């Protein structure tokens, strides 16, 4: 029932424009858990199967078997957005602690943070 | 010509759903400058005039006069998204260093980061 940071949901991202990531696809919850509990929206990063290897420092690979995916995928920490909770469809899986540490580092790079 | 982290642009955020922030409005560039230079997309946080005081730790106030706004506004670090660069319209202003430090801290809170 509770939406947790690091959960992976199916979500309809369309409509989008240009090079924005669209379609119905898995996304990872990256908003903090207090916002997850009490906000009407969540913040997510897109996951794609169209590539299967990290290409840049904002990319994090996720394996087909351990997570519940159609194919080896990659989390795009340069593709983030805020979604009303109604967009979230099936909960598919959730990332390991080690994986989320990779996501945190790519998110720090993506957003120009450093500490 | 170069899009810099901390710049404030007018951008068309619509269409949106539910409690997502929509409409044409100022947004602040929060993506790192390397992504700003070489990606087709930028990552932004929405600014609204519908409130004029920070309400939660993910809110950062910005003053009507120093920045070039219709009214005292607040940056919503819980309202972030990735936009194709074509969405960016007029460049309106850019945040001071001190202001961007406030934005960084709210972004760390919003995204569950800490370092």
């Amino acid at each position: 029932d509770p939406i947790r940071r690091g959960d992976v949901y199916l979500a309809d991202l369309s409509p989008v424009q240009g090079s924005e990531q669209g379609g119905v696809r898995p996304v990872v919850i990256i908003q903090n858990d207090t916002g997850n509990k009490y906000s009407p929206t969540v913040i997510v990063a897109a996951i794609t199967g169209r590539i299967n290897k990290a290409k840049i420092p904002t990319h994090v690979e996720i394996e087909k078997k351990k997570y519940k995916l159609d194919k080896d995928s990659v989390i795009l920490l340069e593709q983030i957005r805020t979604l009303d909770k109604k967009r979230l469809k099936e909960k598919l899986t959730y990332l390991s602690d080690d994986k989320m540490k990779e996501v945190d580092n790519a998110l720090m790079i993506s957003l120009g943070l450093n500490a | 010509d170069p899009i810099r982290r901390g710049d404030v642009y007018l951008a068309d955020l619509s269409p949106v759903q539910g409690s997502e922030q929509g409409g044409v409005r100022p947004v602040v560039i929060i993506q790192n400058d390397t992504g700003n230079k070489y990606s087709p997309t930028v990552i932004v946080a929405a600014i609204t005039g519908r409130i004029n005081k920070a309400k939660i730790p993910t809110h950062v106030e910005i003053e009507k006069k120093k920045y070039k706004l219709d009214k005292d506004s607040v940056i919503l670090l819980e309202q972030i998204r990735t936009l194709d660069k074509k969405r960016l319209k007029e460049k309106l202003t850019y945040l001071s260093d001190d202001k961007m430090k406030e934005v960084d801290n709210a972004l760390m809170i919003s995204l569950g980061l800490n370092a």
Partner: nanobody
Amino acid sequence: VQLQESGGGLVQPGGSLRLSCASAYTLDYYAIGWFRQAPGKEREVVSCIRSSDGSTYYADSVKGRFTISSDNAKNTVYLQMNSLKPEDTAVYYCAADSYLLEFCGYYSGYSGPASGRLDYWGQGTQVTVSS
């Protein structure tokens, strides 16, 4: 065959050469870059372009001497090389990937890959700058 370079050869120092990278696909499918490699060294970024917009990357060693450009009608990307130096001698490859221009920007800058992460590569063409 996907990418195919042509236009290498021998030039005296100070000369010019134009390399061509013929893409099997229209240039909106990916960004395209030129790399070079000398014996026993890793392939290094020279210049990159995303043809659908104008965006480019140039390595510090070739700035103001080399120019990358697109010919959409011929699905070809060119590297115009002027004021060539002996130290520009290398095998020159073109490469293509959806994320190539960001790759050029982030790593030239140099965290570290194997460069084999980019999807498409030509066979390489020899550039020799020598008197």
